[PDB]
Every structure is written in C-alpha cells, then in structure tokens.
Amino acid sequence: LLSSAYVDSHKWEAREKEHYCLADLASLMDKTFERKLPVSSLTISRLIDNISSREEIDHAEYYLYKFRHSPNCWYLRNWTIHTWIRQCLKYDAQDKALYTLVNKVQYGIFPDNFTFNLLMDSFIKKENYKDALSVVFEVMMQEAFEVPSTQLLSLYVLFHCLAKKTDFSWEEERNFGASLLLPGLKQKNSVGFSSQLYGYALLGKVELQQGLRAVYHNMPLIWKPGYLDRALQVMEKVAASPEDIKLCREALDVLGAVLKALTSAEKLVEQLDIEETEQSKLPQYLERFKALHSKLQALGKIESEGLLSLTTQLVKEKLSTCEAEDIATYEQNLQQWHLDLVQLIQREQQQREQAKQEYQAQ
Amino acid sequence: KKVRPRLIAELARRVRALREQLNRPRDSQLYAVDYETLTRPFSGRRLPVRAWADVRRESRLLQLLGRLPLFGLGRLVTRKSWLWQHDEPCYWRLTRVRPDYTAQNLDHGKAWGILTFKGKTESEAREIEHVMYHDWRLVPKHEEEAFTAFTPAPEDSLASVPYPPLLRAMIIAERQKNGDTSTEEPMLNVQRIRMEPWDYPAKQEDKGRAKG
C-alpha cells in the first residue's frame, strides 16, 4: 500500500551506529542487573542497534523486558523502538514484533505512527490481514489515530477483515467498533462517517447484549450511555450535512440488522434509576432508524458502493499525499533522534568524567 | 546522681531505623490485593465492604498508565467515585509519573497532576492521592474537550449568617453596656471560611505510609 519510498530505510540504516559484539552489552546488562543497578536507556538503545540476527532479536526482547522493569524505563527512546521494529522486519521477526507490541505493557513497545504504518504495510504485503487486524487493534488501544495514513490503513484493514469475516464474538465486535469509530471520527468524509456509524452500531449491540461496562472497560471509549443515540445522531448529522457526504448502504443495513436482532431477542446497576434503559428505548430506536433510513434514501445521501471498494478508492487516491508528508516528518524525526543520541553521548561522557572519581574520593 | 547510659536502647533504636530503611517494602507489595478474598496479602487485612465491588470491577491509576506512552503523561484522568458523585468534571492533568518498576506490570507508583475539582482547577501540580485505589478511569484523547467543558456556575453565596441566639444576645448586651446603641444586627462572616467537599483530594505529601 505504502510506497517503496516510504519503506525506505536508508536514513535509519545510515544512523551513526556504535558497533559491538552483542554478547558485550549482554554481559554488561547482566552485571548491572546482578548489582541491581539501573541500566541506561542509551545502553539498551545501543544493544538494539547491535541486534544482528533472529536469536539476537530474542536476546534483545528479553533484555527489553528486563529494562522495561527498571527505573530508566521512564527513559525509553522512540528511535530505539523504531530500530527494534526495523530489525524485526529485517530478520523476519515480525511475529515477535507483533507479540511485543501486544505486550507493550510488559516491554514498553510504543511505536510512532510511522512505525505503526510500516508494520501494517509489511503485514499487508505478506497478506497477513489476520495480524494486521491485531496491529490495528493495538493502534486503537494506544490512541494513535493522529495521521490520515494510519487512519486509512486501519479502515482498509478493518473493512477487509469484515468482508472476509462473518461470525463475530462480542470482544471482536468491541475491538472493531472502537478501531472504526476512532479513525472514523478522525476522517471528515463519507467513508469516515460510515465507519463511525458501523462502529457505533457494533458498540451499541455490545452495550445492549453484554453491558456498558463491557463496552467501555479498558477501551478508549466514553462511558456515557446512548451509543445507539449517537449513531442516530450521526445519521441525522449526515442528512443535515452537505449532500456530497454519503452513508454506506452496508453500514445502514448492518445497523438495521443490529436493531432488528435486538428487538427480536453479583449483579450491579450502573444507570440512575430515573434514566430509562436502552432495553426500553429499543422500539423508539427502531422507529427513528426506519424514519431516518427512509429520509436518507429519499435525499439520496445513501451510498450503495461497497465499503471495501470505497476504502480502496480513497487509499489509492489520497494515500500518496499522506505518504509524502509522512516521510518528511519521518526524516525530521530521524534527525531529531540523531541530535538526541548526540545529547545522550554528551551526558554520558560528562557523567563518566565524574565517575572517574568514585575511588579517587576514596 | 549520674545516670547509667542506655547503650543497648540506643543500639536498638538505630538498628530498627536502619532495618526499616533497608527493607522498606515496595508499592507492588504493600498495595497488592487478592480478588478472591479481597484481602491485601502483605498485611492480610480485608478491604472494607463498600470497596469490594469497586476493587472487583475498576482499575488503578498506574494500572491504566501502564498502557500509555510516557505513562500517559499529559492526559486527563478521572475517578469513578468523582464521576458518580459530581455532575461537574473532575480530573487530574497528570503532569508527572513515577512507577514502581519492580511491579510485574508496572501498575503501582506515584503521580503528580494539576487538580481540577467540580470544574475549578488549581494553581499548581501536586502529588496524587488514592493512586493505589481502584476507582480510576482515563479520559479518552477524543471527547476530552467535550468532557472537560465546564460552565462556571454562579458562585455568589451568603456573606454572613446570624449568630447563635445566646451569642447574639451576649454581643448585643455588651454593645448596649458600652453605649453602642447601633441596632444593626450582629452577623458572622462566612466568606472567609473556604468550605470544601469532604471528598476533595488531600495533600498526599503529608500522608504517611505503611510498614512491615
């Protein structure tokens, strides 16, 4: 999806590596942890640079865990994370990269948007939609939908997965809904609004079938009830918006199906007893949905184009526009990272000047 | 008359101090929990009844920050207790963090934020309290502005209140004895008194810590 110009590694590869035997820094880290002293973020960055093979990737992830569970984990480096991801791509450890990203809690994997898009593009190139879905979910959990490139990538992956997937489990529905609603809100176009409708429909089904806590627990979703109300609000907003904006017929159909299924078919109470429940509001929800769907078809704002097809159109059209700016920002980040590494060396040598005095004081 | 010095007493004092210092327990140890018995394993004390559901259902501040970059530094964090109690937006800006790395999931530690209570913010970021509690929640990056949108309600309130009957009578009698025949009612100013809700966050900096 992304250009080979995007996949370009030349700058990062040309980064001013300090070359060592991986066992060198491995022994250094072992000694530091035996002493129970704090390893240096710079040290772990250099080890990540010195990664040179698959078993070295394994050693590096082990040391990454050990450092993450260390005082200086507060000093992780985005360039170090990017180097890790690039090395995993290099040595075909993409499975390990995905696992570490999922266990970001245990390891601290917090890649930038550029690295997220890199991993997603690699997965799609491999055709690994099943795992591109997981990467999209991790982006959702991290709340990193700040760029149209990532937004479009996630939308395309999710719609492809929906096309190739029929049976759904409520947790999968939750993940899909969140990962669509976020970039859907980000994208102020017909595709974004249709994605918002789809995600709201899924989340409302989850809310009414499992629980609003089940919806908002650990997700980047609000706890205010009325996801179906927000869906109807989105449809009304589209209807009142300029006609060029359209809602996907597939999104409308799935929303109608959700409403129809809900209508057809220890304990704690989270809602104020005076505020009626979605279970009671369901008939009004269905009536409003029918009226709004009829109004939208009358206005012609409905779009019968396939979700995946329209997303592919948008990807082929606007992606490169995003790619150029993304690569420019990536170069800016690369030179910033080089300057930051220079600063790290400055601090390390300045402190070593004093560290020469440990026994001198004695 | 000269006293016999208590060398062993001094040694015991110093040794106990040093032992406590060198075995100061970790946060992940102190504030652990058993979700079956709802008892803290370190001390074996059972949590109060009213916190059982919250402990079972909700999550801790660091338990959330562990799933964010920079430990979610700069994000707005709200507490479930605050959300339930007050309709106004209450939260911390979470300016700084310091987790207990020794924890397996890094779900304990300390934090510092700018308090916003009932929609009225503060002048500085200070230490959090009840970090170890379970009633915390995260404001999603989106919806942050809408959630924090607070309309300052009219704050005008009573300037003064009547004295208690007997105190009023005493003051009036003293005035009349002094000849101050001014009949204006005696009132007790209350603006000077800064009433605060009982659940308002307290100064964690002055709070103590558990011991083994």
């Binding site: 250094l28 000694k31 530091t32 002493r35 002293l37 704090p38 240096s40 710079l42 000093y75 601090r347 390390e348 402190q351 070593r352 560290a355 020469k356 440990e358 026994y359 004081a361 004695q362 | 060398l7 062993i8 040694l11 110093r14 040794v15 040093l18």
Partner: peptide, 27 residues
C-alpha cells in the same frame, strides 16, 4: 531531568553491616 551511574568502577555498600559488633566494641 535525567542522570546515570556507572556499573563499572563502582563504589558499593556491604550486606548486614552488623552494628552489633560496633556496639560490642563500644561497651
């Protein structure tokens, strides 16, 4: 802001300093 200490050239404390011996000397 940030600082570092070096696991090389270390200066280290001791385990169980045993101030009991120090008082046994004192008394």
């Amino acid at each position: 802001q940030e600082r570092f200490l070096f696991p090389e050239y270390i200066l280290d404390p001791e385990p169980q300093p045993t101030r009991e011996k120090q008082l046994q000397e004192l008394q």
